[PDB]
Amino acid sequence: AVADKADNAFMMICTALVLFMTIPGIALFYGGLIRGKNVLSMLTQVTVTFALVCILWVVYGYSLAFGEGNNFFGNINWLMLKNIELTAVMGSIYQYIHVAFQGSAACITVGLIVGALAERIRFSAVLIFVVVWLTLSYIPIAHMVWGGGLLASHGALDFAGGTVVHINAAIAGLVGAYLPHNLPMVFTGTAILYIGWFGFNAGSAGTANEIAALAFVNTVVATAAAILGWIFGEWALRGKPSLLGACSGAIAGLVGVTPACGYIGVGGALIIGVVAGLAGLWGVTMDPCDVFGVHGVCGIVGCIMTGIFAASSLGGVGFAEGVTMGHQLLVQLESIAITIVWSGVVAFIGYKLADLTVGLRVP
Amino acid sequence: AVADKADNAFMMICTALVLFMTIPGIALFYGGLIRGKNVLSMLTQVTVTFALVCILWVVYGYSLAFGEGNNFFGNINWLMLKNIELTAVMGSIYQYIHVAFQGSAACITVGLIVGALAERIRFSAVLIFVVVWLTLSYIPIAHMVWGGGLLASHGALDFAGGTVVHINAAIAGLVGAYLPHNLPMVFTGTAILYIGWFGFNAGSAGTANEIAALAFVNTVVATAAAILGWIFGEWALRGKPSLLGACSGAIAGLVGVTPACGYIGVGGALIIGVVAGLAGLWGVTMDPCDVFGVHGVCGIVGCIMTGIFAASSLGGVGFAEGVTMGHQLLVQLESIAITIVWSGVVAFIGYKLADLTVGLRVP
Amino acid sequence: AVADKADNAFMMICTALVLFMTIPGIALFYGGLIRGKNVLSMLTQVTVTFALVCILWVVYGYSLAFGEGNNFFGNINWLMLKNIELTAVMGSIYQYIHVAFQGSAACITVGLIVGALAERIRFSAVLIFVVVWLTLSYIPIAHMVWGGGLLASHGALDFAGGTVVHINAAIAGLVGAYLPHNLPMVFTGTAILYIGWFGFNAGSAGTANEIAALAFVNTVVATAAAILGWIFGEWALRGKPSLLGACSGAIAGLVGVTPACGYIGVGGALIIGVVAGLAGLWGVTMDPCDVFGVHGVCGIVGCIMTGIFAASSLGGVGFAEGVTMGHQLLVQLESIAITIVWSGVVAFIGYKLADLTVGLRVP
Numbered sequence A, B, C: 001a002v003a004d005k006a007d008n009a010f011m012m013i014c015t016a017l018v019l020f021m022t023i024p025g026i027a028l029f030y031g032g033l034i035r036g037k038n039v040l041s042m043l044t045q046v047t048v049t050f051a052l053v054c055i056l057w058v059v060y061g062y063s064l065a066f067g068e069g070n071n072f073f074g075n076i077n078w079l080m081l082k083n084i085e086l087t088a089v090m091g092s093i094y095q096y097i098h099v100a101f102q103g104s105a106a107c108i109t110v111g112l113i114v115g116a117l118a119e120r121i122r123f124s125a126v127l128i129f130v131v132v133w134l135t136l137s138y139i140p141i142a143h144m145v146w147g148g149g150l151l152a153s154h155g156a157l158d159f160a161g162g163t164v165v166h167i168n169a170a171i172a173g174l175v176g177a178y179l180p181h182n183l184p185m186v187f188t189g190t191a192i193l194y195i196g197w198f199g200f201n202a203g204s205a206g207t208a209n210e211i212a213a214l215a216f217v218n219t220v221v222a223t224a225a226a227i228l229g230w231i232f233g234e235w236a237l238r239g240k241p242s243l244l245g246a247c248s249g250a251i252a253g254l255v256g257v258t259p260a261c262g263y264i265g266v267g268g269a270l271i272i273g274v275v276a277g278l279a280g281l282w283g284v285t286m287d288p289c290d291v292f293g294v295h296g297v298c299g300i301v302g303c304i305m306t307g308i309f310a311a312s313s314l315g316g317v318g319f320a321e322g323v324t325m326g327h328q329l330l331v332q333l334e335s336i337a338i339t340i341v342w343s344g345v346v347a348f349i350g351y352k353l354a355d356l357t358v359g360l361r362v363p
């Protein structure tokens, strides 16, 4: 295996773009939504926990997520990236770039939860939770889906983190919840997330090829379909579009297309944006800062609709051989369930530990 | 034709950077200029119409702009990108990346007009206009200049959208006009536009080659020459530089260099920044948020000065064989006129239709 | 020598990212720190002096920095980049891209000083200073370190500007000093600097290779180690972390890792973030907007700790042959001293000239 420099370049810029989604994307997104008295604190918890996620990733996270192991977790053979030679290639890029790319995804996922709960959760409790849930939920699920684990070895399609990122975080966010002051800033964070999101979606191809290209366009497309789906729905229900309505729409589409971008046709992308846009709207019409209402609802949707629109018939890249659409759909449904239930338990364990240790508070 | 992954990578990042110019670049630029009571609305119209432009592009825009057709428009053979195979190569990159790159340019152009008129134009009227003018002005002109059409087939030089983007939008903006509350935010939008602008200028080479490199440097250069041209002029006239004066200067240079970046020497870039900077200043001294004063004036200027500084004599890449500077200059002048008059008629038709349909308003 | 397009692409995006650090990164960073009545002015001086640095670079800066010359400065043979053929290759990329990359570094360095002193220094005095100090300090030191000069030809390790950028600017900032209103904005500027910083650190490899990959990861790593080092230290001393404490932490790590990113192991990166984080904290506990407290202190630290962690023993890329760690450490110490004293004299000459010309003021 030899590293292609074009792929190195692409994937290093993609990692930067995903890094950009957390710092400052998600921070500015929540920063404009939450009460003003809470913004600095929230900004601090996103920053400190990003730092944290970065460190646990390098120390053992990556090895556990992407080390060869069982169906559920990797190994502790790549502790602080050792026995990864500098010139070790994975795919068509240096493994170090995989390490950095994959860590940036862990980061935005944690950032999605931490920003939602920075208000109500006590700092030390968030840190405890983050450590628990990254280790026992993000990493194992990462392994199961992208790391050769249970779900991958069963044929699950999730190009860019419909389960790993979105459903996973949405359920974490809900268990927590269970247990807008600056719209310009909200828009900026949305804009930065959207731009950074191409690093995540396109870079999930691991190379600058026809598939990254496909992921890219499907992302422009489904983000736009969703925006208009939301906006029209909002104009139907509420009489007029709103800025927050437009930004939520975009996220609904970005979320919905996340599992699907690498597998579907643009026709399929557009239909996905549309449906995710409206389901997002319906979702928030029926949970901290609507974490689930958009990420949970839309993630489930994207994941299901991937096992439809991958069909070569519907302009998709085609299912694996011997895989009927019906089998793929069951496998999607299974992946979703396994993610919902797994992130749930772990979330509950995280929040409970934090609570029995420092208390969820705040004081 | 085989896709070069380095070019795929480059052009996918360039598209992201051009996407960044609209979301949130232009939005934040106007967001700080216009009255506060109008910002959210403007932010919403830029977002919703971006979504729209994205969708019309995928549906028929691209096929009409870059399909093989006549002198003026392409075909409806690539409706929803069909009969474009995934691995179809155009230039040295996948065609899908051309689709995404070219759509991001349509987006920033519409964003330039929509932001300027979000205040005074009624939403549904903007949408109607956008549809009319994208279809009948942006697309045909795109085709004429970059799509094998009338102006290209006559030797016009316009590397990165002096006519297609700037003059085109400036005239749209003027017909409309005919028919600063947050300078920090203005600066941020300027900064984001400038950074994103390298995707547009350098990526217009279609490859990561000596010409992209040339476009890049000419962009650093002419943006700086212009800033100082404006600033000094402002210090001469007004007694001191201003932040808005500095940001306008930058845009004057970015606009002025847009047609020229791929064809000229750095000596030529600097002279272009200087002249565009002062003409921009003179321009706004003598029209919504000075859309024309800078884009129209400076676009015309860049376009004219391209047919001078392309000269191999003046450090440029040289004119095509058999093309004297005098012939190039006439061809520039013709391209400008054709753009001014074409965008005018279409603009007028767009605004008139909107007016007879929903009314330009606002209520 | 033949240009690799993957490297062209990578380095053109890296330059964009470094450009992003100044416009708007550093501007927004200082913009939120300094008094509100001073923000627009500061924003204007960063913009105008960036423009300036861009122009002097193209005119003679690059030729003086990277032209073949003596130990201390290059030549005036590349005035306005002439006798640099368009297709001239340097390393594995077009020379034009080196020109643009290296100029973007000059820009962020000047931006670091100008933002710090925009308040207290008179405009014309800043301009005079900038011209003096860029020409006589930034350029010669650039030449000495990255341009084949005294320090390089003695084996100094400074991957990405520990002396050239950080110590150099910190001493300029101190001589000047000798002679927070918006924390959300501070965070945004920090975020943008951090993201842009990967262009500087990774792009300093000149290619998208295992070393750029190494630089990248070491950057994620040391920024995170530092954030937590600062944060814990701040929690130890002040009872709780703060947003500004978190952002300063990040910068401490980014600065500290700057010389080292291309030479060390991730184990070494983490230790560097930790130590730089605390030394930054200790630094500001014991100078405009703590320019030295973080850049001077942390730069010195990174530079020293590079001559330790480069050791192949400590997971580093190894010292040059015949170079013991002890010899490298002396060479680091010498590089630092030469930089501290050189930037000092020149700074003093710059400020003194400005003072005798227009007066440091402000009026």
Ligand SMILES: CCCCCCCCCCCC[N+](C)(C)[O-]
Residues within 6 Å of the ligand: A021, A026, A029, A108, A109, A112, A160, A161, A165, A193, A197, A200, A201, A251, A258, A289, A290, A291, A294, A295
């Ligand atoms: C592959 C993409 C991974 C990105 C993770 C999430 C980023 C978008 C977050 C937007 C938050 C919107 N909201 C309020 C519905 O949660």
Ligand SMILES: CCCCCCCCCCCC[N+](C)(C)[O-]
Residues within 6 Å of the ligand: B021, B026, B029, B108, B109, B112, B160, B161, B165, B193, B197, B200, B201, B251, B258, B289, B290, B291, B294, B295
């Ligand atoms: C190839 C570049 C295409 C970019 C289109 C326009 C972006 C810059 C817009 C700045 C608006 C400045 N103003 C007020 C003079 O219109």
Ligand SMILES: CCCCCCCCCCCC[N+](C)(C)[O-]
Residues within 6 Å of the ligand: C021, C026, C029, C108, C109, C112, C160, C161, C165, C193, C197, C200, C201, C251, C258, C289, C290, C291, C294, C295
């Ligand atoms: C290789 C990196 C070159 C970047 C130059 C400096 C950028 C960071 C500036 C942050 C300023 C922080 N502060 C207040 C301590 O000066």
